[PDB]
Amino acid sequence: MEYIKLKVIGQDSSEIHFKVKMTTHLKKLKESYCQRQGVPMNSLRFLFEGQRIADNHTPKELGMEEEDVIEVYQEQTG
């Protein structure tokens, strides 16, 4: 499958939706999220299934499935 739908959730209850390529680096999703929410990349870390998402990870590599949740946390800034 070329694309996957994902949502990014925060502890503040926000839920932001994305549709991205399965084989594209997740750095590009992180950058989009930061642009949409008006915050810098160094201020957040993103987890999937309890593990940190590296910039070079892809949905395919991580075994993501349609409408999976990704969690965003505030980083020490610090």
Partner: protein, 156 residues
């Protein structure tokens, strides 16, 4: 089968929508497939409580007659809490077939119910002598022990 079809449903539901900061993932079989009868989970302490900052690991074990029966929920390692047995097994009435378990209860509801228990112990039905006695006799020491445990299990 009845258990496995329900557990596959629970997994699909959890992946799409689950409470923030929790983890619930089936273990694997030798062939790389999922073992839906044995899940590795984690429950975050509630913010604004002495549990804040901890992430507490738990195994959820299902019997073959699930969802007639509740899973066994066991903290690994065993947790200091009045309603957690020395073994790590959690005591909670929704987790007993002949008390408040209902087949429709979901994994989200189980994990949120255990989370709620953390800062709201049930002193009518203690499970371990140590955390129960300290809770009853010395709440200041109880909170020191809880905050130390939360630090020990804080994500790095």
């Amino acid at each position: 089968g009845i258990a496995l079809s329900r557990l596959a449903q629970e997994r699909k539901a959890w992946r799409k929508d689950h409470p923030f900061g929790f983890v619930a993932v089936p273990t694997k079989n030798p062939d790389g497939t999922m073992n839906l009868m044995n899940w590795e989970c984690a429950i975050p302490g509630k913010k604004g409580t002495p549990w804040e900052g901890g992430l507490f690991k738990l195994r959820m074990l299902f019997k073959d007659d699930y969802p007639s029966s509740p899973p066994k929920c066991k903290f690994e390692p065993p947790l200091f809490h009045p309603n957690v047995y020395p073994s790590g097994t959690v005591s909670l009435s929704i987790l007993e077939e002949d008390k408040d378990w209902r087949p429709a209860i979901t994994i989200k509801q189980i994990l949120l119910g255990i989370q709620e228990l953390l800062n709201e112990p049930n002193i009518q039905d203690p499970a371990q002598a140590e955390a129960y006695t300290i809770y009853c006799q010395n709440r200041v020491e109880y909170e020191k022990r809880v905050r130390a445990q939360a630090k020990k299990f804080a994500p790095s």
